[PDB]
Amino acid sequence: CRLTRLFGIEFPIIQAPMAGVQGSALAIAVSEAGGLGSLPCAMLSLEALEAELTAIRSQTAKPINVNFFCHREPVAQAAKQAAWLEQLAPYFAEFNLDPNRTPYSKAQAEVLAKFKPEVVSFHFGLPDEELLLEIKSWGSKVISTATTVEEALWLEARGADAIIAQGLEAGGHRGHFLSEDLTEQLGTFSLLPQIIAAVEIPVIAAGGIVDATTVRAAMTMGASAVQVGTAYLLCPECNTSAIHREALQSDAAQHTALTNLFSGRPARGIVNRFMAEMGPMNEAVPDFPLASSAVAGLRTAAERLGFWDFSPLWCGQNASGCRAIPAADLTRSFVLSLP
Template sequence: MAVKKALTEILGIKYPILLAPMAGVSTPELAATVSNAGGLGSLGLGSSSVEKAKSAIIATQKLTKKPFQVNFFCHEPQEVNVEAASKWIDFLKPVFVQFDSEPKQNLTKIYKSFLEDPQMLELVLELKPDVISFHFGVPPQSTVEKLKRTGIITMASVTQLSEAQIAVARGIDILIAQGVEAGGHRGIFSTEVDPALTTKDLVALLQSKLGADEHVPIVAAGGVMSGQDIRELIDLGACGAQLGTAFVQCKESAASVNYKQSLLGQNKDGATQITSSVSGRPARALISSWHTKVDVPGRPPHPGYPYTYDVGKQLNELASSQESVSPDRFNAHWAGSNVRRIRDLDANKLMQTLIREMS
């Protein structure tokens, strides 16, 4: 029987701490700081064009010689349901009216899937980042093999055993076990099948069913905020942990000032809730008017990801521009369930704190 390598040895890092690849929040500076401190930095490129992705990868490679991951959305592409889109827009119109505006009538595919963007694969094969990870699914085995032949380590977010089995069958090297506590969008392959397992339960399940047989390292993600959390999850069978919300407030992140202040202001109650109304996929965020004014009984079905996100971003931007005069907040401030434990530290100090707490 082959001996399972340590996660740190596989990834070429000193500590089993991974930065979650948060699209719209991650920056080359944040990724490089985490990598230079001994963890695995990350770039969330799921919402980036090929040109922007290239720029971000090159910028990060200039800031660190250490490994970091690049992450892409791997959802199954779908065409917009015109009828559902029309009903959803009509449903949101009264909300737009209160901001003296109207939603646009045609929703577009604002984000491409990695599955339908061969140029993005070519870019990754050209620039050869150390690690690539996938969210919302995994690419075909042939694509995974191309990446691995180039020396790139592959990872995928999974939220249940069936997804993990698919990822392992296609040759993925490392599983990110993402529990329901996670902030933002979990990597659910199909929104129709969501068991909503906690991080601990998911780690235990995958360790029991896959850990001993497949020799696939399992990284815990979702609600992880401290070194003690990391140690506890490792004791349960995880090989390391991935943290997102803990790093959003860092000065190196691209989160807005309002976003960071909102996170830090949640230290007392930390109220978060999952909604699919913003983007079309379930995502955990700070409680806002999305949860109280849109997610109401009887709301119509949304048109799905990423079309729902098109109108969601319109409303988010509109409300943000008028938040000083409006009592309703339609910000999508993604946050994990343990956001109340967030700490106001820069990325390097947070890494040093996590490392100290782990030991």
């Protein structure tokens, strides 16, 4: 296959970079198993970043994927922020709380340059051409997420080596960047074959790929690989919180929705009180990534009391594939139905 050769990996599974639930130990296990392991870097300081890459490199020399956000920083909006804070006042009262990141840059480049990742993935489009040329000159393949056909064509045109097609079924943030209109986005079943028809480069399927059968359906459609997120979230290598783990296993896990309430940007998570009462979508939330600061305390407080009411419970529309077995074992689950 085209991506196994291009990436130098055995199996056409990519473990989805999932910021906040996961680091080196899951990336190591999946790359050692023969797929592509992924380090989410969106929330890492430069110190954490270098540490975590050093930890990866001293347990495997197999390929890995380091992931970054390259969104536009929002624009000052202290008042929009203050108005949102005012709206949450009732929760602050209830929980007795006193209310009292950062796109890929040259700074992250300098650290990456020491390690030279086999792949560099981006969410929310691509960085500037210079940053991109710097990356390519490490030997790194560059991939990014498309949620429409137009986005896929934009990525090809700007030199992406592969496109991640994420259907609406996907957990975590929508990686859209040409349009704010969510009705332009498609489910996996329709996005995948339409992106493959439009581009010449390889296409990775993301959104609802949770098991052998679904991996098979994806490849049948002409995907060169699959990116799998939600179905690793119960693996011991994952740092998924007890309360997030509990939600995934409950029958609430089946009902998810797109919400901007936690971050400023549409993301899919298990439906909770905060989303039901204030959303799921809300036009008053500040631009990404400002909104996190306003719920950080509530989340902490409500989790401490064992409520998942104010948590970002990122999860796709098929939770049925999550299993508490080693991620290497699980990565092999996924490839049984392939030739």
